[model samples]
Target: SMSVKKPKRDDSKDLALCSMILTEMETHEDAWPFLLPVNLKLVPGYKKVIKKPMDFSTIREKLSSGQYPNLETFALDVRLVFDNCETFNEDDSDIGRAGHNMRKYFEKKWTDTFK
Candidate 1:
């Protein structure tokens, strides 16, 4: 009988994990600010500062389209959402605090599941 083999970099499991984590983040109470891209017109100069703006909706599209090659790449985009939030809003501001909360929740989930 022939034996089956698995690829060293198999991504199916990670992809499923990413999908699960993403859903959780989207439903989180603090998810509002990161759910969609910043309104450039509403937020003057936002495009100038956040050249690589990231958001949950965009991440969902990327995940659905298989754009993220690995878990790290998916995680990078998630972090980018929060990073951009921090860059544009004050630490004590509502949106900034929401970003911080969301990031902390994600980091905890990432470690609890992967690490």
Candidate 2:
């Protein structure tokens, strides 16, 4: 069965990425390439409930202490998050510079959420 409603598309945003992020988390798709933008340690996701509360500062300290091989994985994780959160490519309709700022925010998160 199908239901109908107003498209409700907003010039201000494309909530599809937000919707996808929520759905992916809800469905426990942690291994998904795009899961990087989410802060797993600080917030209790409505779905896939985290095992522990996040402390990004602690995670950053750990990263700083990481050995060479370990640091590689951490950097890769940050890179992947930034790549997936590149919203401009998917939705050219967005009005302003949300893409760059959004990317910066998530990248910082990925870099800081390990400990």
Candidate 3:
């Protein structure tokens, strides 16, 4: 029988991106409701229910498991989640500034940001 070795991986980029963005905003606590994994609907009576806000476990599992080959892709997915939050909420969305800051953070490109 042959045994195979798994490569060790780190999700530092993902964590850093999230941490920096979350901390840079004045409305940090406000951003959490958006970070949660849930659907958004505007049909008057439908509300998206999420168990956890900013579920780092799920993101960590995906990232640590090598779901994305590049950090950019992972960051993109995260930004999209925040986008959904802004889209679903009113003009004064919680993650608006947070998400905007995240976009600004990635303006230089993920790889560059890391460097």
Candidate 4:
């Protein structure tokens, strides 16, 4: 009279890694522009151009609140932040350059950790 337990994929380690990578990105020198949500008032038409705005603070909140079910989902939001930056700013602009640097760093960490 024993009950059988079903096997489930565990992402606890992946989640921990996601948190580590996030912290590293948050502390990065180029993390300035992405620390928080963009100031729509300051950046005119930002909302019109970038519909799905993402940022480091928002990602941390989602991570802490268990909104992400897996590392892939977490990565999606991280990538979104960079993608939004590229879409809204010029390649050589201050914010744009920071975004590119941050993206490159994150991808490198991602590859080293998971690949």
Candidate 5:
């Protein structure tokens, strides 16, 4: 079972593109299109428990909420969503591809913004 509460962090600051990705996921249905070829094994037999879209919403909420002050916390929240559920193709799967893209996208902007 996934914990509902987020642990506190002191170094949290809003990263622009990271924040923007959350908005995009909220605003556009096309954002982060990962095809769940198999049903997500949500909580053992409860594959229906956490729908993929709902999990996406949860990730977006955690990251956008200011609860995660550090980027590591934010990424951990995202990773946990996948960890708690069943993914289609393991590490090189759809969510994996999509999240990797998000990190790469965020990294470029993060470097440019600070450099």
Candidate 6:
């Protein structure tokens, strides 16, 4: 397939695992380790599109207005996010701050500051 590059409201859209994920967010920062990348077998469309399940009225309003709905599903969907974590071999790893360590840094500060 040809590579397409159109700017989206969220640059994260570019990270979708496959076309089916355009229907939802494919990767999330919080669910970095649990969600594995998978190529879905089918795609859905409005009128008869979704095979999983959808509450369109809730999302359509926000999607059309260029706003994401502030709904519980937002949190639930994070469970479906694919691997956003970086894996490295001890010697040849890319240099820079790592996500795991960065999370620990903030957590340590919060724990220390509150105590």
List of clashing residue pairs for candidate 2: 41-54, 59-115
The Cα error of candidate 5 at residue 29, in Å, is 9.0
User: What's the CA error at residue 71 for candidate 4, in Å?
Assistant: 0.5
Comparing 2 and 3 by TM-score, which wins? 3
Tens-place lDDT digits, model 6, residues 35-87: 33222344223224322333223333434454544323432333212112232
Clashes of each: 0, 2, 0, 0, 1, 2
Cα TM-score per model = 0.89, 0.25, 0.45, 0.89, 0.39, 0.20
- Arrange candidates by lDDT, highest first: which order? 4, 1, 3, 5, 2, 6
Query: What are the per-residue Cα lDDT tens digits for candidate 4 across 1-115?
Result: 2686778666559878899999999999889999999998888989899999999999999999999988889999999999999998899899899989999999999999988
Q: Report the Cα lDDT for residue 2, model 3.
A: 58
Q: Write the per-residue lDDT of candidate 5 for residues 57-103, one digit (tens) a residue.
A: 66565665666676666555545444443343245766566555554
Q: Runs in model 4 with CA error above 4 Å?
A: 1-10
- Poorest stretch of ten by lDDT in candidate 6: 80-89
Tens-place lDDT per residue, model 3, 1-115, is 2587677566556656654543443244444544444433534422444322343335555655767666666666666655654555554554566566555554445445465
**Which has the higher TM-score value, candidate number 4 or candidate number 5?**
4
Whole-model lDDT per candidate: 0.91, 0.38, 0.51, 0.93, 0.50, 0.32
Best-first order by TM-score:
1, 4, 3, 5, 2, 6
In model 4, what lDDT does residue 49 have?
92
| Poorest stretch of ten by lDDT in candidate 4 | 1-10
Off by over 4 Å in 3: 1-31, 39-57, 95-98, 101-112
The count of residue-pair clashes in candidate 4 stands at 0
- Kindly provide the TM-score of model 1 when superposed on the true structure, using C-alpha atoms: 0.89
Model 1 CA deviation exceeding 4 Å by range: 1-11
TM-score between model 3 and native: 0.45
C-alpha lDDT (0 to 100) for residue 65 of candidate 2: 58
